[PDB]
Ligand binder design. Sequence first.
Ligand code: CL
Ligand code: CL
Ligand code: CL
Ligand code: ZN
Ligand code: ZN
Ligand code: ZN
Ligand code: ZN
Lengths: 332, 333, 333, 329
Amino acid sequence: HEMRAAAFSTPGLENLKLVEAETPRPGPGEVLIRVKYAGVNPLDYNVVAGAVKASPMPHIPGSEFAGVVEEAGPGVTGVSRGDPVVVYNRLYCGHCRQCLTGWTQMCEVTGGGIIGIVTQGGYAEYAVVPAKNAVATRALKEAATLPIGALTAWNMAYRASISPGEKVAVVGATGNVGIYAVQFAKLLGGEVYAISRRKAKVESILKSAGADAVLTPDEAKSAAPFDVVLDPTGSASWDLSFGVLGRGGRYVTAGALTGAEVRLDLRRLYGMQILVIGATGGRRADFNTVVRLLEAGRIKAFLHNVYPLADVRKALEELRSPERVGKVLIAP
Amino acid sequence: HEMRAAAFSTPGLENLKLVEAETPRPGPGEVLIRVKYAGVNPLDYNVVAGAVKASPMPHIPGSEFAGVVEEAGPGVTGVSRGDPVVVYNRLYCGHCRQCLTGWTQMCEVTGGGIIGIVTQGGYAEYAVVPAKNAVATRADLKEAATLPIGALTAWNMAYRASISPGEKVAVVGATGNVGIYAVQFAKLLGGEVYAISRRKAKVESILKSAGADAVLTPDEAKSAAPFDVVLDPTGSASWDLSFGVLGRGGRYVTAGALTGAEVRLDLRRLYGMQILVIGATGGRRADFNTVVRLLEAGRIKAFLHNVYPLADVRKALEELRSPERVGKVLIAP
Amino acid sequence: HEMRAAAFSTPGLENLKLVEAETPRPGPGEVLIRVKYAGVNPLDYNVVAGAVKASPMPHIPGSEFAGVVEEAGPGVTGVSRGDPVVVYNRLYCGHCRQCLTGWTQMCEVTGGGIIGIVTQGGYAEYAVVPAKNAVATRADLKEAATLPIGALTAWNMAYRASISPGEKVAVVGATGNVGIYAVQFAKLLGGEVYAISRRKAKVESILKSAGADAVLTPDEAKSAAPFDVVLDPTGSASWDLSFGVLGRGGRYVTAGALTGAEVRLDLRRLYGMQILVIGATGGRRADFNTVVRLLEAGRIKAFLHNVYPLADVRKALEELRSPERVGKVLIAP
Amino acid sequence: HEMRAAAFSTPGLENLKLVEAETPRPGPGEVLIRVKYAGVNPLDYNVVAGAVKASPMPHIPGSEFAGVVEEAGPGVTGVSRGDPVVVYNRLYCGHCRQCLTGWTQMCEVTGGGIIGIVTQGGYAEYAVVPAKNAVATRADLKEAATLPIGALTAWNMAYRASISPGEKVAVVGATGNVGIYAVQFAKLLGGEVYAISRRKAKVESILKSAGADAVLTPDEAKSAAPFDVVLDPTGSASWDLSFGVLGRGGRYVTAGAEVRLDLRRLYGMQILVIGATGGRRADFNTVVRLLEAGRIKAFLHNVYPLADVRKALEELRSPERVGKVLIAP
Ligand SMILES: [Cl-]
Ligand SMILES: [Cl-]
Ligand SMILES: [Cl-]
Ligand SMILES: [Zn+2]
Ligand SMILES: [Zn+2]
Ligand SMILES: [Zn+2]
Ligand SMILES: [Zn+2]
């Protein structure tokens, strides 16, 4: 059996090519999934561009996908052929200190290894994952926005300890993570201030996602202080995100694995009793929660475009586009 | 120098009389409030029935009220005459361990003393309260008058339940004043909210409009179990059903109105399921400010039923006992 | 091929039953719509109850709905599969004296015929309507489904009342589906808007957020008289309390839901005060587009009470008469 | 007794002198008002500049004012000493075809004569006006003094424009005294209001707080077209808007000022070009009530004492003025 796939033998977007590949077969504890939709994320871009080493080489990227189970590996029970599933993207052992306390994305054994980075991912017709990573859902186009976009945002909001009344600023609120951070900050009862430079073009979308106000970076300085800043853009908005925080403010940062180094004002940190909280991925337990919330309609998938596998390079480049407002998906 | 008020020299609903009393005067750290609206709650009823002892005697009840500052006593800054305010109803010292950790309703010096139970209350044209308890508000005062007991109690129950988004929250007594706010807060916190009511045939849609995702009779609630959280402001009435529907790690939060009750608690089920049985009363002084701002922002909603003049206080207490419809009963002096 | 639908073969609320029925197919100039939301209105109640004759029989009611275009029939253009639409509910020919002057609800060829009364309606998964009656909208379809009766009727009443800024406009039945939008349009045209309601405490906040400057009981409205305009969407229910509040040159704009509505008019008061009694029904096809555009812009608001599934259609229709109800009841097939 | 007043004997701001004058006495049908606030408008500037003849001479200008009734003339009833009032500025006879149909500003007997132009006006401690022109008000007289010209002229333009909810209304010169109320009335009537300004950054927030849905420069407005209504308080829209910005059935209303007009475009688009001036006496009562109810708002820039009347008038032309200038005698 042969399948279509987007693969690169050397990093660089220019080397990402449509190829024909041996359709993998699921081993013990694994399932084979017919990928229906895969997300296009800064992480996928950075994998292809070479900012993070991938395996195997040549490499099929794509760390966020949903599809239908094609074959269950020997001794696999719990999910079976025909089941629509969405895939939690971290490999985890289930027996180390981190997995047993819920932080599967910190697994000491797998290093937090990401499907589509340390294994072949979803920019292909078929992919093999662990069966325990595959979550049956009745939601697949919307579900394919969950493994990175929604789950990362949930994990940030969870780690910020937002409480009703608290002023929450979301930097990068039009990005895949930020759009779900707006939603989760509102669902936890926050007063939600969404920040984008394109406020005029995007204000309707962001309020639809739960924002109480949309602000440019310079206006947010005037709306300070905030009790929480959710900043999924890494080091990119560090200067603005730290200075708008009030007493006891929580700055939650996540990122897409690219170089990020900043200058921390210790005097302000200790004087204001601010917390700078790292977040990455999400817990395996909370992925089930995010899937159920999508099924219940309590969170929403904001889609910009769906592209065939053959347009994967243009889809990746559309992450940079000022006209893009929402998620870009690939459909093998 | 004189004011109208409702008062009783001895307990009993029959003994609640419209009188003329000496208009009280604010001392230092106090304000005098022209009462615009006072809530009618189970607590007030039980004070007038004698189920809870009041002081002084004879007694003006009314522990939930809003109005306009008429006079500021010595040393008072930050409120002036004309200010519409809604009154936090727990006296608190600010210096004990409970106050200093924010549990001002547990003050060790005042014993949690409730305005209108250990002081004269708001069933009167005027009342005196500490200035630090009077919160300035731009909300309509009829709606503000639902906050000191109804909303704040419900908030404090929901806060003590550590509700996480997605968790299933059942609210028992969801048509009552506390319960209808418990539905709103459970939803505001991301819960999936199931309002339980024997009257679902009549109250289903009003409870949906308060934020419930579904409304269930008790028999349907058994089939919808398990729940992660049960909020029960009605004390001992619903105990076996509220406790039986809880899942692993479930939290049962109970509040009451100082009527005595006892339940039979199966500790084996409690420890086998790692359930928590959590008492809640009143709310935190800091959280009352938050509740006031949430009303002003329209993030929660005051469900009102009828306003009665002071002279119909007996009719008003009766309407609490057998309501024509769901919502808060107010007294307007 | 088969769809679920609420239908009745003889009138009476007890005979409205969930059935399976042939999915209808769109003939020329017609579209098939997957109904997302249908309004529950007094008009739908009166059709099911027998006050109005429906065709065909057995009959699927529901004159107010929005949804997603599923199939376009022969000859249809500019309306494609998946387009969310809300349905103008009057059948019109486009060529008679009434249609050509804009009064499409007065069409002389179709007789003003209302979709879901003279055709099968929206209390089903699918309904076929004329393509030109389907208005594309980017509004949430839950909100859009409050427009074809509630907002459009209200708009048409306010428009025919010649309201000018400053004028005192009383809206009776102000919490009904039409009334709540009539508050909004009277205010949008510049009126000083008095919402008249006897349950004033319960509905004041919602009516003020719809744009009422004040909320008065009917007896307070007698004391606040004179008014320049009464918007009255309740048939004959309010006439005997409200007609007397109009001053000189006042306009009494009457609409209703097709039940008997005979009243006694004092011709002497009418001619002595130069009052106009102005009939209003439905609205103009052109104005429906405007009302849809105003909802998309946020200039008018849909005030929802609850959404029921199609199986609960009898409960939804009876909730229309509930003392508990404030706001729109929707059916979601 | 004597009063302070600004008067001129020959035209020109530099000839507007502070003098002492006999306080006038109210005759039949008149009241004496102690002026509290008087507006500064282009009309007062042009009267003082000599562009409009005035009487009597020497002349006290000031056509927009509010104050307190000090004395009622013989036989006057209805309004009483001590009443705060704001003055409708058109003399009207009450008996001709215009007055009887409500167009008092068109009165055929008085010629539309304006108080402070054909009578001594409000830039003085006291002024005499007809009793029927004084409207009692519970509004702050500071804000009331913005109504007889600013608010009323704008109301009359929006009235004559037949604005329907949803119509797109462009207001030219939107920071002017009339323009800023025109923004408000266009919004109060349901319009979608585009305020046009060359000073867009300086005034955007002020125009939004007056009810403008957008603030545009003249070149940005070319793209927002077409408009159903163009309100042009000063007759200057031809410098900021091509006649082509008006849509089908479009209405252009001007309350001030020769221009060149494509008749073919006018009849082909069924456009209306509509003149407006002052306001109807009945509508003045309505404007006063809307201010009292907070439904329209007075945007003030500065208040000057009567001694600074020359600076107040000249401030009408300052590029730094955003809002109304008042004199307080
Ligand atoms: Cl992104
Ligand atoms: Cl209704
Ligand atoms: Cl000006
Ligand atoms: Zn592990
Ligand atoms: Zn204490
Ligand atoms: Zn016709
Ligand atoms: Zn005349």
